Design a protein around this ligand. Sequence first.
Ligand SMILES: Nc1ncnc2c1ncn2[C@@H]1O[C@H](COP(=O)(O)OP(=O)(O)OP(O)(O)=S)[C@@H](O)[C@H]1O
Ligand SMILES: Nc1ncnc2c1ncn2[C@@H]1O[C@H](COP(=O)(O)OP(=O)(O)OP(O)(O)=S)[C@@H](O)[C@H]1O
Ligand SMILES: Nc1ncnc2c1ncn2[C@@H]1O[C@H](COP(=O)(O)OP(=O)(O)OP(O)(O)=S)[C@@H](O)[C@H]1O
Ligand SMILES: [Mg+2]
Ligand SMILES: [Mg+2]
Ligand SMILES: [Mg+2]
Lengths: 315, 497, 256, 257, 330
Amino acid sequence: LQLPWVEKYRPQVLSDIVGNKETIDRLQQIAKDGNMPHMIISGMPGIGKTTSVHCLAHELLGRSYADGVLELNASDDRGIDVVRNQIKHFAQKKLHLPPGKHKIVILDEADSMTAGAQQALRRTMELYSNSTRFAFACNQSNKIIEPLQSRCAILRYSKLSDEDVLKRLLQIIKLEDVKYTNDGLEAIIFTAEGDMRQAINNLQSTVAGHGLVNADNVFKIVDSPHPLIVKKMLLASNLEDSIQILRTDLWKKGYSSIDIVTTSFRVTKNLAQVKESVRLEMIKEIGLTHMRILEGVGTYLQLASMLAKIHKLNN
Amino acid sequence: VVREEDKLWTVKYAPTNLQQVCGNKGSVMKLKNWLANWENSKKNSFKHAGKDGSGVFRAAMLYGPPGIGKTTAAHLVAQELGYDILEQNASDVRSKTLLNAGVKNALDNMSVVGYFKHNEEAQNLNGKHFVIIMDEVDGMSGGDRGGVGQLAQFCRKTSTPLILICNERNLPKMRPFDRVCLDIQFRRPDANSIKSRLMTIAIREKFKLDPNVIDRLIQTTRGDIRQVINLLSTISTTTKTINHENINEISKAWEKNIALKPFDIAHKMLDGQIYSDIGSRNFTLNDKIALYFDDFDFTPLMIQENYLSTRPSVLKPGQSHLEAVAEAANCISLGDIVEKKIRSSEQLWSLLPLHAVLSSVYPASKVAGHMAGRINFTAWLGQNSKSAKYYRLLQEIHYHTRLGTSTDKIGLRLDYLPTFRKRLLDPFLKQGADAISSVIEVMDDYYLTKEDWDSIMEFFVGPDVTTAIIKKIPATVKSGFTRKYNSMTHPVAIYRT
Amino acid sequence: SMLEAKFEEASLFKRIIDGFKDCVQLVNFQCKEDGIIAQAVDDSRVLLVSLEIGVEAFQEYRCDHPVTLGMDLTSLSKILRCGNNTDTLTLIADNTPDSIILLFEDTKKDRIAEYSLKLMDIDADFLKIEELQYDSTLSLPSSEFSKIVRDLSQLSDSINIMITKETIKFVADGDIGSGSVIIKPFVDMEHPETSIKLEMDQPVDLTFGAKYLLDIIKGSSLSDRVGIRLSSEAPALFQFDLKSGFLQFFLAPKFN
Amino acid sequence: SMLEAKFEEASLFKRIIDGFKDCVQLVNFQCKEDGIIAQAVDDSRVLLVSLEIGVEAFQEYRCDHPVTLGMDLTSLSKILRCGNNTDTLTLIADNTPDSIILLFEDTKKDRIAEYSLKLMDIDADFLKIEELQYDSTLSLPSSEFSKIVRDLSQLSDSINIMITKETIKFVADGDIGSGSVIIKPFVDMEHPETSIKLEMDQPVDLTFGAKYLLDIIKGSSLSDRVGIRLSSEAPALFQFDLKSGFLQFFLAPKFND
Amino acid sequence: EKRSKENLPWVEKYRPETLDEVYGQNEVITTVRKFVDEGKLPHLLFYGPPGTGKTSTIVALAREIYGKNYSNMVLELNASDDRGIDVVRNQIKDFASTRQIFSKGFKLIILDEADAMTNAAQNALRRVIERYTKNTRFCVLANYAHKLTPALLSRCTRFRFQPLPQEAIERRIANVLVHEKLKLSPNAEKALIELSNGDMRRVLNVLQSCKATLDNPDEDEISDDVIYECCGAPRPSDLKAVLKSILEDDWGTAHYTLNKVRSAKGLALIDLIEGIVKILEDYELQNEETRVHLLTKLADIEYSISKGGNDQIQGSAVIGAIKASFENET
DNA sequence: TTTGCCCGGA
DNA sequence: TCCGAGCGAA
DNA sequence: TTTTTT
Ligand SMILES: Nc1ncnc2c1ncn2[C@@H]1O[C@H](COP(=O)(O)OP(=O)(O)OP(O)(O)=S)[C@@H](O)[C@H]1O
Ligand SMILES: Nc1ncnc2c1ncn2[C@@H]1O[C@H](COP(=O)(O)OP(=O)(O)OP(O)(O)=S)[C@@H](O)[C@H]1O
Ligand SMILES: Nc1ncnc2c1ncn2[C@@H]1O[C@H](COP(=O)(O)OP(=O)(O)OP(O)(O)=S)[C@@H](O)[C@H]1O
Ligand SMILES: [Mg+2]
Ligand SMILES: [Mg+2]
Ligand SMILES: [Mg+2]
């Protein structure tokens, strides 16, 4: 098989990463001048965290990458025993590198590591820092214990903006000779929601499907994000329109009742424009329906009743 | 060998002597005084304590939040007084077995390294002795079974100075150390205590730091000096001036998002500020639910404990305090139902956010305001423990008396026990030691032991409480009761329960 | 290669490593034109291990410039256990090494096994162990010391040693009461190897941990005899003499 | 019955089964007039075992028409344990069978122990996977291969085999370091069983998972010599020869990262 | 399998064998077929409700890619298998990182019913999926997206299988009728499509039962009467009679009518409630309060029925709910 | 700002 | 005989 | 025994 575009066009140098401009600039500076600090990179899915850490490591270490990098992720064993033996030994080992370069321990998806294992890392990080530096990547930074956050440089990545995604997509499009219209790329950006991985996946899917990337071809295969549909449902002014949205855009498209109700909860939580007490009442009603569905009564009537009760509240 | 421009700023600017340590000067002096007089206090079996009261402790326990200078202080004091240092931390295995097979042998042993380091030096008394540093005691997880108890034992039975370090002193697992360690608190240092250091670093590394923003930096990292130095190191890579034009976004990007502990969670959740329009805009519903997830086994219990103890500022117009409390109580009950469903055989963890709202956020939103007293630990845990004990005792009594009665255990408590009290206790009050035989006859009829007698008398409440009545019974009657009971055999209902 | 040191039979290095493997974890070897000197300090910092292996132990030895090799004992031990005792073992190292090569060769079968062991960062300089003016110096067959130590280990977790004029006393006082062993310098011409030799300037009395001595006596397999040196208040020296070098244990005593 | 196959002693079949028990779970036996062949594939689909037992392994053998018997190896081994190593073991099957009969009978007494193991509906082809002209073919004593594998498995999770003109090289690189064993062909007319044979057209270099090799070497109990056949594009064949037939392991190599 | 395919249930006898026999998912089929044609297969996610063709499609894709010997060239795992963290780290990772035993080519791993896997296993999958993409492709299948982690969802190309539309079901029914020598009336076909809710399994199961219910399937014709008989479901006329009686008659007559209609064919109460809700959805109502009361009360009754309860009391509850709600209509 | 009962072991 | 681990199990 | 982030 040929490489999927997501892997084919994975950046290999820091200058090919879009977004988070100031942080990427700092990383390029570090890669040029060495002395890499301990660092924690955090943010939402598919915005360039793993890519940035690997690019930085490659540029720092050159041909010494094979012996000078220890990578561990969720597919690896990372219990307290591994931290106390394998990582400690790698931190203690001899390795001559050019001045300003250090061995690098990459702990990808570090937010799944247990608290005890994290505790076991503190003094290894402190004692061997003249030869080893640690890079953590995670999605939920609050899952890294405070003593480890204290020893690290904090790099919180923001979601990619429509302009960054558009720029990267245009690069790939020119490289692949893709025919497109502005509405098509705007539809791709709209459905990606700031996840570059999803933007490239849906671009490949549209091109494979229908050749030309216009809005209609995009929406033939790519769904508009159902959280936005649910938000529209929750904000409708009269009960009949909200029920119409539920019926046509969610229930008859095949979305499960449990998916609809959990999305309703998540969206109501974040509806900053509705006063908080109203959202608490709505959450109570949504939770009642959620419990009924989990008992096995996940019918369209239950969701319609949920909508009716929310309407009674917001009135 | 290692260039200075290859080192982390936290290493190249580490304090080299106790003077260079910022803040906590009183704590450092406490530690230094404790260690300096350790031999003198040892000569008196640690039975005489001076003005500071430090002469009766063989061990010292330092505590405080991250990156404020605890490890630095311990190592520097040990070096200044000329001791050899033996260190263990959370990267070591500190179980009871390993502790007993390892560091134990050094509690009363000279150091060979210390001997050979200062063999030439004349009159170096401390060079051959150890200071044992046990860093990161709070980090001892399941890989260190029995470790904390063994360390407390050492704190009582060590012949060489021992310093322990932890971040969370008030944790339950740290209780054993309470009476056997000299507690030294380290607090967050103030911006003034570190302004000179930060400005010196700015001069050395050639970037412009405006002193006026340093306070904000200090607030950004919550007094974490290691973190502030890390921040300066990282920011100065491309930004050579930290001032009022960039401090806001730097502070936002590097802000300490630390989980809170249970009493703190309860305090913040019941604060009325976060439930107002502006407060809700600033501290969002998602943030409140995250508070629930900081400690999701105690937060519902803490809220249920303390939601009656406020003066509320969020009351709706015409809604009295009691009506708001009733709404909160109703929501707490619903939350309990959800909680039951979560921990059933279904394992419905997807309801956890709902529970957070029903058990903690919604009732708090109903009664939030100011606290009319201190935040209290939940009483439900202890009351549940007590109830479990008494139900165990009731089961035992029930199956001793089963062959004679006709009832379930609940009927035994509600109906039978009040009459057993009149057949088993009141005759003592009305007849002294003449009732011994009759009481023994009843006990034999119902296969009851002396232990059952005590248990039964424990059960009564209200005007029928027995503790003071039995305390009043003359010791002659109790001794005669026990002697006559132990003088004979007694039938048994269930051998080897 | 800058360093090439060849044992005709790998069993030698193997027994040497087994001598002190169970009492330390990291060992620093220094190789120079005159041979190899190793130092190790245990985790508790109570015991020090010194090793000297001269050129006479090597079928061939070359080392252009001095070099230090920090090694973990467990890894080296497993690698050595992956080698034939009767094979020829060559320690090879290149300039500023990151690893040490152990090369086993059996020329009878034309079978070569090459292992590479990654070196360690040990930030601990060599300790000066210049000979001290010991108060007492004795020597006795290793087997007698091993038996005495093993027998006194069960009685108590500590062992006391007292050296007086023509008298050596070992004592263990603890949970199982008090057990004592008294010996004297006797010379037997029939079997000189089993002679007990003593030389005392001042009376000496020290105490030591039992586990440390149990680890120390594991070196009996390298030497038929053991020499012991003691001072008023100082580390006790226990020396086993190898064919061309020695293994020394410096044990810090108890206080008082 | 339609199929009747008598092992003089049940120990033969037990050792044969124990030779590959640990690698696979479900096994498919096809019995024909010329003997019994069997195939199995491990859970991860990385290893395939192929067994051949000829009529000479049996005191008596009869298979009127081809028959296929699918079964779980744990149940079969459990049953084989219930019988004695000394008794005569007769495998019996009927046409279109729902079970396989294992009949343990000792001539000394009149004691018959009959077990019936229910069979699975395992419908899978064997494909007779064997490439014609392998790049390199070598053979060496089983104990030496076992020793090399066991030593190198302590160092890494992967073992590389490199065959070049007149040299066989095993390599493993891991966290604490690396190991490399080089052997050369050699004929010793005094002890042919210690010989190391190597024929080769194209040099080869392939990486294998260590745990699979550790399972494969358990066949050494069934044969003094192991044959290894390697090709750039095919699974590696590890063959142990039995007095009558053979035990083969086909192990796929790792993808070149 | 045993004996002929004529011994199989119709839901399995008519399982699509090739991509051309998958109906009502044309956009997905076109896209994936041209993925295969061009050699560009990404990591796939098939999301959809029961019986819409997800497993059928992925197995047909494997058959097309690898030929008839696909089963020994893919790793298929579903909820009937253990898929804990250990399985991900050993079995899945080994298959992903190793060449094929039988025939050279890329590897395919099919995680059917992936919504049954734990969070920890799904997280372990992330870098397995990314690291071995060059030689391995994953396909994930699910009915419930909420049990899939955001990181797993990000890495897959998503395809939604819709509830099967009317035309696709009609064509499949025509094929079945030809093969079974069955006759089906137009009203019966409409009733079948209506009750299937776009689930092909329901269509096939009901059709098999209907054929079994005929006296002579060669001459007898499946009419809507037969469908309602075998399903034990209300006729539309019964639903309308009950609703009319509730909306226009006094309590005694409405209670009598509900009981008599139910007794006629032993109808279940929940089926009447479902049918009446479907009818009432199309009503134009002056007052939103009528809709609110109807929906909330009927949902409460449905939930109480799900736990058992007293059937007579629940029927009276339905009557009262509808009457009281329509009182708001004035 | 941390309860009540009371483990396994000495 | 004394002591409190770790869990909430009435 | 642990849902979500923007
Ligand atoms: N900033 C970016 N610039 C260019 N491509 C990107 C960027 N972010 C993501 N991608 C693309 O999406 C793919 C995945 O990027 P990753 O860095 O692995 O995302 P991630 O942040 O690590 O996602 P998680 O946290 O593991 S779900 C890359 O191979 C790129 O092809
Ligand atoms: N009071 C301080 N004065 C000067 N530097 C400090 C101070 N506190 C922390 N630092 C700096 O941060 C580095 C780490 O200090 P530590 O003493 O290890 O803090 P800590 O209190 O032990 O943090 P934990 O408990 O291990 S998270 C020091 O080497 C200094 O560079
Ligand atoms: N699009 C379809 N075209 C033809 N037959 C279908 C179709 N969908 C379902 N069926 C039929 O229903 C049966 C089940 O189809 P499946 O593809 O296994 O359903 P599914 O989507 O995997 O359902 P879940 O998600 O496992 S409950 C098939 O054997 C077919 O007989
Ligand atoms: Mg990533
Ligand atoms: Mg510290
Ligand atoms: Mg399916």
